[PDB]
């Protein structure tokens, strides 16, 4: 998940592309 369950200041190795 972006924004929202893992922090809105960090982006997982699972959201973007």
Do not use: A, L, N, R
Not at 1 to 17: A, L, R, V
């Amino acid at each position: 998940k972006c924004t929202s369950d893992q922090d809105e200041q960090f982006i997982p190795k699972g959201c973007s592309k």
